[PDB]
């Protein structure tokens, strides 16, 4: 499922991850289009940040939505 996560300037990120896809690498695909490496896009799932596997069903399994991500560096 394609995502419409907002960014630092109202951009979009295409996760292309289904609701059963874990957010451990789902944020990497969203940040692949934007440019950020996998373990740097500390995305906020409308109230919390995904940790470890973090299957997308935890974040209400929303389709697309708008996930404002943090630009937290040095997290690699």
């Amino acid at each position: 499922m394609l995502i419409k996560v907002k960014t630092l300037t109202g951009k979009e990120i295409e996760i292309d991850i289904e609701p059963t896809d874990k957010v451990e690498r789902i944020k990497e695909r969203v940040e692949e289009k934007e440019g950020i490496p996998p373990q740097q896009q500390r995305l906020i799932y409308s109230g919390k940040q995904m940790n470890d596997e973090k299957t997308a069903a935890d974040y209400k399994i929303l389709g697309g939505s708008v996930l404002h991500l943090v630009l937290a560096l040095r997290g690699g």
Partner: protein
């Protein structure tokens, strides 16, 4: 006994007589004096039952108490009129003030104090002519009332009646040997009050009574006050006084048409030119004895105009609407000298008209000139700064550039005005400091609006440096509201009110740009308010992390970049992590938080309440107080 006192006071105030007599029936002499003379608070008035009966026009109640029960006529009570508070006024003063002739005649018959003076030296005859009742005025004078007695402001009975539209009492007072040359505190005479109000009939009685026009405490002739008041009929009422000379007549005619040029209630383009036409024509009458006007040098605020020194120059601008509005400001200021308290109002109205016509450069120049002329006179220039912010927000809202030196000029005025307002808080005692505090808070809000406008302009580097220097000066003057909020605290607070008048659509709080611009200028980021909250405590209280996430993110990294102690704890023992109320804000703080053994050790010290005073470094006691 006290419970019946309220009913007795109510009975006298409500006008009931049979119930009042029944309540006072079978009462001993001790009960009569206590019930008739006990003050009661009702509607902000501490008035006796007899006084409130005279104020409410209950003559029968007054007649019942005065004739039968023998109540004193010299009791003092506080009354509340239409915006005026009078304390210590007897029942005769209230009866005359309320315009009840049927109550006034009863008190004087019993022996009331006709020449009674209240706290502000107020005569019942003065109150009667203030209310406009001629019958009370004629009766009081015939009952040995001193007309010449004035108030603490040196305003006699004739002078106050000259301000209000009551000609009949003025005519009776003038023929009752009243002084027309009596001056108020600021030298104002009776004709001065009539000139501002614009009473044609009252003025005609004064000049017949040898008015002997003189200047007031401000050196302002009342003939020019009517010209300044847009009173066309009053201006051509004193020109035939046979002692007004020639130069004074020119000054009056020039000011009247100029006042007509720039005034909301009395705007007319045909009388604007005509009144100035005759004044300059009278100058060009003798020929070899010409009276050339002492034209002030041209001001950049008023374009490049140098008034009109020739008859053909004003004729060339007969149909010029822009010039006639602009010329009227110059000649009026040239006459007044810009020192009057009302010279700025036509300028501010002309600027408002220009702004309402989508002409911004001219209105900005005129408003800046008005602000300078008001700040040099030490005026309450807070609404002026508010409308400056409003017009700047409208300029940037219509997508036009704003002149950065003009922003610098108003910013330089705001920082100096705040110091004056800072003095007004400290100098003024607890009488009007509550309003002064509100004005100073409004000044801080207007400064924030100005800086928010500056965050959207191009900000050339020299002008940007000047703006930063002004903001640095204001910050080092430590601007703090009554809540302990600094500029940063309000700039990071969504609860800070933004003006709805053309401003809330542009200035949005919290704003990360202004905060950034407030940290590059060096605001004390670890400042504490009355609640102990820092800027970081306030910003994490924001309840809108989705609608504007960046304005919560780009401010936090802006906040903790100069040394905003993320672990510093408020007066109520709350870490900013504890005052999160938002997962996004708390995770942003956690990402921006860097651990330090200083913080952990201080928190462990305070969590166990070890005595540290006079044992640890002096700078470390404050750090302990932080956590």
């Amino acid at each position: 006994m006290e419970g019946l006192a309220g009913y007795v006071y109510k009975a006298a105030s409500e006008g009931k007589v049979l119930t009042l007599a029944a309540l006072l029936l079978n009462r001993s002499e001790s009960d009569i004096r206590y019930l008739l003379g006990y003050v009661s608070q009702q509607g902000g008035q501490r008035s006796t039952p007899l006084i409130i009966a005279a104020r409410n026009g209950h003559a029968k109640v007054v007649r019942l108490l005065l004739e039968h029960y023998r109540v004193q006529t010299q009791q003092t009570g506080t009354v509340r009129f239409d915006g005026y508070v009078i304390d210590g006024a007897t029942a005769l003063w209230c009866a005359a003030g309320a315009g009840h002739f049927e109550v006034v005649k009863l008190l004087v018959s019993h022996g009331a104090n006709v020449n009674h003076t209240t706290v502000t030296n107020s005569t019942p005859l003065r109150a009667a002519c203030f209310d406009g009742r001629l019958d009370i005025v004629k009766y009081l004078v015939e009952n040995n009332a001193n007309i010449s007695i004035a108030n603490k402001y040196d305003n006699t009975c004739l002078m106050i009646a000259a301000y209000k539209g009551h000609t009949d009492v003025v005519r009776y007072l003038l023929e009752q040997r009243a002084d027309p040359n009596a001056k108020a505190h600021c030298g104002a005479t009776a004709l001065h009050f009539a000139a501002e109000a614009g009473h044609i009939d009252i003025v005609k009685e004064l000049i017949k009574w040898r008015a002997a026009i003189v200047v007031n405490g401000h050196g302002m002739t009342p003939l020019k006050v009517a010209a300044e008041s847009c009173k066309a009929d009053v201006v051509e009422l004193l020109l035939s006084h046979a002692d007004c000379d020639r130069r004074s007549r020119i000054e009056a005619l020039e000011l009247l048409g100029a006042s007509f040029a720039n005034d909301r209630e009395n705007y007319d383009i045909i009388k604007t030119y005509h009144y100035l036409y005759l004044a300059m024509l009278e100058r060009f009458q003798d020929g070899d004895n010409i009276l050339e006007k002492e034209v002030l040098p041209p001001i950049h605020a008023y374009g490049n105009r140098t008034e009109c020194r020739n008859p053909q120059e004003l004729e060339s601008i007969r149909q010029d609407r822009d010039a006639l509005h602009m010329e009227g400001l110059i000649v009026r200021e040239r006459i007044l000298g810009a020192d009057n308290i009302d010279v700025s109002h036509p300028i501010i109205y002309r600027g408002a008209v220009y702004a309402d016509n989508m002409e911004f450069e001219q209105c900005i120049k005129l408003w800046l000139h008005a602000l300078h002329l008001r700040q040099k006179g030490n005026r309450n220039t807070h609404k002026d700064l508010l409308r400056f912010a409003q017009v700047f927000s409208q300029m940037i809202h219509l997508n036009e550039t704003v002149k950065a030196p003009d922003i610098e000029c108003v910013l330089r005025c705001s920082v100096l005005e705040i110091e004056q307002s800072m003095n007004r808080v400290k100098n003024i005692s607890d009488a009007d400091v509550h309003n002064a505090m509100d004005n100073y808070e409004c000044n801080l809000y207007t400064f924030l609006y100005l800086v928010c406008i500056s965050t959207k302009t191009q900000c050339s580097e020299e002008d940007q440096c000047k703006i930063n220097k002004q903001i640095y000066n204001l910050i080092h003057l430590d601007p703090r509201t009554r809540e302990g909020f600094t500029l940063l605290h309000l700039a990071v607070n969504s609860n800070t009110p933004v003006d709805d008048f053309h401003t809330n659509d542009v200035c949005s709080f919290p704003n990360a740009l202004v905060t950034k611009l407030l940290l590059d200028c060096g605001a004390e980021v670890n400042a504490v308010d009355n609640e102990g909250n820092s800027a970081l405590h306030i910003i994490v209280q924001y309840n809108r992390p989705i609608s504007d996430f960046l304005t919560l993110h780009s401010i936090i990294i802006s906040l903790v970049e100069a040394g905003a102690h993320t672990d510093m704890t408020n007066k109520q023992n709350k870490t900013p992590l504890d005052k999160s109320t938002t997962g996004v804000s708390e995770i942003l703080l956690k990402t921006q938080m860097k651990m330090s053994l200083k913080c952990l050790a201080a928190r462990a010290v305070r969590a166990n309440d070890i005595n540290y005073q006079d044992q640890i470094p002096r700078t470390l006691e404050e750090f302990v107080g932080f956590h």
